[PDB]
Design a protein around this ligand. Structure first.
Ligand SMILES: Cc1onc(O)c1C[C@H](N)C(=O)O
Ligand SMILES: Cc1onc(O)c1C[C@H](N)C(=O)O
Lengths: 258, 258
């Protein structure tokens, strides 16, 4: 049976090919995760269908309804068999779904419009002029909401009450906000995305400071899935073979426009 | 049931405390992994006994004899219940034992005596004047043996046949060799150790170039062990709580000497 792969439209992980309107199925997409999915499928010997997550979210549990959304929800409720995307491995997610060992390492970082007088999370927490926020329904927002660390707690206290909302629905929306805010908005997103955008026209944004944490992305499967073991080994193999490093260079720097 | 923890004497992960000769049990040791064992045990609710791996090795499968040695062997043959040490998550190991998500991220790096005219792996491969090797029975040696990447394969071809042997039994042995070879020997070891040593007297070593790969250390358990799940969630919890970062800052920086 064809394996249903849930993923998210997030450059450069999954993107629409130039002539996608003339293409069908998996041929409509290109990107790091499109390439990765092919490698994993070949190694695990299965056929698959890439499907873009319906609500366009990574995945969080509704504190009220206790219902999971995004890619996590699609796995939890049986809509998809596996998730291949820049989905972060976290405690609350590991409680409901399985994750392979990481295929990419990263951490939350700060994106600023070049020239913005900010160099750290501490800087952001101390000032009021420059607003800052994160993407909704993901591990980054949960990071600040749950942090007991002084700096991050202060930032969360501010973000949770900010008006207008400093939270964005997608990475693209956040990038646009940084670029159009004349330096009055800083965006908290993972290092992977930050460094990617840093290499794309108009080259007006940049990553400042070190990462706030260290974590990774994992391929996810519903709890008890029979695909789990083989996928985990496939990831480890592809990494040791240097394929993952090649894919990173391919989509991040070989095509860099800055 | 007292959980038997197999680990290895490797500074600053596990070290004999001053006057350990008059100490007993777990109290004889100190270090990053000693602290981690305590937190993991507390979260998983178990008592444990730290034991230093008999052959002082990380773990590899002997060709021909096909028997696993080091900490991996301890787990595989039932000598230990869990391994808490700087043990790299690898494909071949994952085939015989289980690993938690990583508690530390790192990569293979190059250590040189300060002043050595080498800045990359390519440099080492492009010459023969400066010898170079890795530690025996571990992920680093296996990395070169299996790599199909031009530079690394060329390096392996040289190392496999070099005389006298460029392979060392322990990192301390590799470090001492770099320090006493007047720049005629470079050492291939993980970034964690390289960075640690660079801040220690006689402050005569340094890391050059970026890491060759990206991987992590995981807490290992016998395949199918009941401890697997709880340990994995414990590692994720501790990382998200910021404890893993505090622990590294404590054993690498707070104590740093150069
Ligand atoms: C990608 C990405 O970049 N910044 C982020 O917060 C994310 C989403 C994050 N990886 C998640 O799984 O929620
Ligand atoms: C620690 C350490 O530092 N360099 C290395 O090769 C190692 C050993 C490596 N972590 C293993 O598991 O074999």
């Amino acid at each position: 049976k064809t394996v249903v792969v849930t993923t998210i439209l997030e450059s450069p992980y999954v993107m629409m090919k130039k002539n996608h309107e003339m293409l069908e199925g998996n041929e409509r997409y290109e990107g790091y995760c499109v390439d990765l999915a092919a490698e994993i499928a070949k190694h695990c010997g299965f056929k698959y269908k890439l499907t873009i997550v319906g609500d366009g979210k990574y995945g969080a549990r509704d504190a009220d309804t206790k219902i999971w959304n995004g890619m996590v929800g699609e796995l939890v409720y049986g809509k998809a068999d596996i998730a291949i995307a820049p989905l972060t491995i976290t405690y609350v997610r590991e409680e409901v779904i399985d994750f392979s060992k990481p295929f990419m390492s990263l951490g939350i970082s700060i994106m600023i419009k070049k020239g913005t007088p900010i160099e750290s999370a501490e800087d952001l927490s101390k000032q009021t002029e420059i607003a800052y926020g994160t993407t909704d329904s993901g591990s980054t927002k949960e990071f600040f909401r749950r942090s007991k660390i002084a700096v991050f707690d202060k930032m969360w206290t501010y973000m949770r009450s900010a008006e207008p909302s400093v939270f964005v629905r997608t990475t693209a929306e956040g990038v646009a906000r940084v670029r159009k805010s004349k330096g009055k908005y800083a965006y908290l997103l993972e290092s992977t995305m930050n460094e990617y955008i840093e290499q794309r026209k108009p080259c007006d944004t940049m990553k400042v400071g070190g990462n706030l944490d260290s974590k990774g992305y994992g391929i996810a499967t519903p709890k008890g899935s029979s695909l789990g073991n083989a996928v985990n080994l496939a990831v480890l193999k592809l990494n040791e073979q240097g394929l993952l490093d090649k894919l990173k260079n391919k989509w991040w720097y070989d095509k860099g426009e800055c």
